[PDB]
Design a protein around this ligand. Structure first.
Ligand SMILES: *[C@@H]1O[C@H](CO)[C@@H](O[C@@H]2O[C@H](CO)[C@@H](O)[C@H](O)[C@H]2NC(C)=O)[C@H](O)[C@H]1NC(C)=O
Ligand SMILES: *[C@@H]1O[C@H](CO)[C@@H](O[C@@H]2O[C@H](CO)[C@@H](O)[C@H](O)[C@H]2NC(C)=O)[C@H](O)[C@H]1NC(C)=O
Ligand SMILES: *[C@@H]1O[C@H](CO)[C@@H](O)[C@H](O)[C@H]1NC(C)=O
Ligand SMILES: *[C@@H]1O[C@H](CO)[C@@H](O)[C@H](O)[C@H]1NC(C)=O
Ligand SMILES: *[C@@H]1O[C@H](CO)[C@@H](O)[C@H](O)[C@H]1NC(C)=O
Ligand SMILES: *[C@@H]1O[C@H](CO)[C@@H](O)[C@H](O)[C@H]1NC(C)=O
Lengths: 253, 165
């Protein structure tokens, strides 16, 4: 394909004609909606599992654009749009008229005045053409700061996951920069990446030869083996290469 | 007749090396209900329960990896999650951790308070796990209120869909 992901604000995640940004400052719902509005956008609208499957991989709980009407007793989006079925599971956590998004397309009912982190989302068409385009990526891949990512839920061993990424002219995840790949902070669970142990030298190196830079990953022993799973807060859990796990591909440099 | 729902996720490690598989034992109103592993759930189609329990099992594997024990050989971390619905519409719920079969850490999910054990040997296990859950896993109260809500949501789903008949 080699498509430029369409008009988005600078350093936003662009996926399938939709821009996204995750705000780690915890604000209440009203403050959070204002914050998205002040950036010419609004809170997360969830309209399709297919076009927004990036949201399957998100860690933790975040304010969403969904609101409850006392009179109706129905749930609607900030702009008045109806909540379609076959999208969200609304769960009764707290008494309140707002909802937190969480992965597996869940929505927890929360008190609107409780501080939480939040997700802004704006469509590519509603951002003007004089703005940031994310660098060349394949059609249906997540573009963030010109690097391209896709998350594969069909679980395979390390070697098969390499071949899988190879078949799409890509390689397994390579962490090279906490700044440029800070998106990886919000990934949930663990996933195969391209980091391999050389047993003789006792060293760690990437698929393409590159040696692991210092102060980039924390490596923990879990299962004895010569391969590493990525997990959140830049961790690298040592796992047996033959153990089937999920994986992350990325377009190479 | 309080209706109850109880999950029992178990992970194992040999000589520090945490095994890839894990077994889940679910009890519904006291009676056995589901016996899962990573691959599938069997009733003693369950695709939602497989997806949910596997994600939990992965997280518990990482937890055990942060419990660096001197004792060699077999070690087991088990996390229990239980909730109830009484006749008067009030709820009970809790999260419990067993290491080698011995209870070392509990949380009342109604109040989000932790119960620490008596011996300082057991307190060492507890503060290891709590350090992991707070710093590495990065779990706020929200996580635990969601955990509470998830257990009650499933119990009400299993009652409403007619799985006690
Ligand atoms: C109660 O629910 C109705 C729908 O049953 C809501 O109607 C929506 O109104 C907004 C106004 O901006 C429109 O954008 C939507 O198109 C309407 N919904 C539908 C499905 O057409 C109504 O907003 C709710 N009541 C109040 C007082 O807000
Ligand atoms: C969690 O489930 C495991 C099995 O899935 C239980 O382990 C069994 O415990 C009994 C004794 O209570 C033994 O007779 C069995 O041989 C054990 N089986 C295995 C595979 O270890 C365990 O009791 C459950 N944990 C809790 C806290 O109830
Ligand atoms: C802001 O949002 C509006 C639609 O709500 C859109 O027309 C406009 O192009 C956006 N950007 C700017 C810079 O106004
Ligand atoms: C949310 O909390 C506030 C106090 O912090 C309370 O006044 C309000 O009624 C709560 N909302 C509910 C119960 O819907
Ligand atoms: C360590 O050994 C491996 C395997 O022979 C070799 O490829 C590598 O260049 C060696 N030296 C390093 C990583 O400094
Ligand atoms: C009992 O509680 C549930 C959920 O907390 C609620 O749906 C139901 O309306 C309550 N029953 C009565 C009689 O109020």
């Amino acid at each position: 394909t080699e498509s430029y992901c369409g008009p988005c604000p600078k350093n936003w995640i662009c996926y399938k004609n939709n821009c996204y940004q995750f705000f780690d400052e915890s604000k209440n719902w009203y403050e959070s909606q204002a914050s998205c509005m002040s950036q010419n956008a609004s809170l997360l609208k969830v309209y399709s599992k297919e076009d927004q499957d990036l949201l399957k991989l998100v860690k933790s709980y975040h304010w969403m654009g969904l609101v409850h009407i006392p009179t109706n007793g129905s749930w609607q989006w900030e702009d008045g749009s109806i909540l379609s079925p076959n999208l969200l599971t609304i769960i009764e956590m707290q008494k309140g008229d707002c909802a937190l998004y969480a992965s597996s397309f869940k929505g927890y009912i929360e008190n609107c005045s409780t501080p939480n982190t939040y997700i802004c989302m704006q469509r590519t068409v509603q951002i003007p053409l004089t703005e940031s385009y994310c660098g060349p990526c394949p059609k249906n891949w997540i573009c963030y700061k010109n690097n391209c990512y896709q998350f594969f839920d069909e679980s395979k061993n390390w070697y098969e996951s390499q071949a899988s990424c190879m078949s799409q002219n890509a390689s397994l995840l390579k962490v090279y920069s906490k700044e440029d790949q800070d998106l990886l902070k919000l990934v949930k669970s663990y996933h195969w990446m391209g980091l391999v142990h050389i047993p003789t030298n006792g060293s760690w190196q990437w698929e393409d030869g590159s040696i692991l830079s210092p102060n980039l990953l924390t490596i923990i022993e879990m299962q004895k083996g010569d391969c590493a799973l990525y997990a959140s807060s830049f961790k690298g859990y040592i796992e047996n290469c033959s153990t089937p796990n999920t994986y992350i591909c990325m377009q190479r440099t | 007749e309080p209706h109850s729902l109880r999950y029992n996720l178990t992970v194992l490690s040999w000589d520090g090396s945490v095994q890839s598989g894990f077994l889940t034992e679910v009890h519904l109103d006291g009676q056995p209900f589901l016996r899962c592993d990573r691959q599938k759930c069997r009733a003693k189609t369950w695709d939602r329960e497989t997806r949910d329990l596997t994600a939990w099992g992965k997280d518990l594997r990482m937890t055990l990896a942060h419990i660096k024990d001197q004792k060699e050989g077999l070690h087991s971390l088990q996390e229990i999650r239980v909730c109830e619905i009484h006749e008067d519409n009030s709820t009970r719920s809790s999260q419990h951790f067993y290491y080698d079969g011995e209870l070392f850490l509990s949380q009342n999910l109604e109040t989000l308070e932790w119960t620490m054990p008596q011996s300082s040997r057991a307190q060492t296990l507890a503060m290891n796990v709590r350090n992991f859950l707070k710093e590495d896993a990065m779990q706020t109260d929200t996580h635990y209120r969601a955990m509470h809500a998830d257990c009650l949501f499933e119990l009400r789903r299993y009652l409403k869909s007619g799985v006690v008949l």
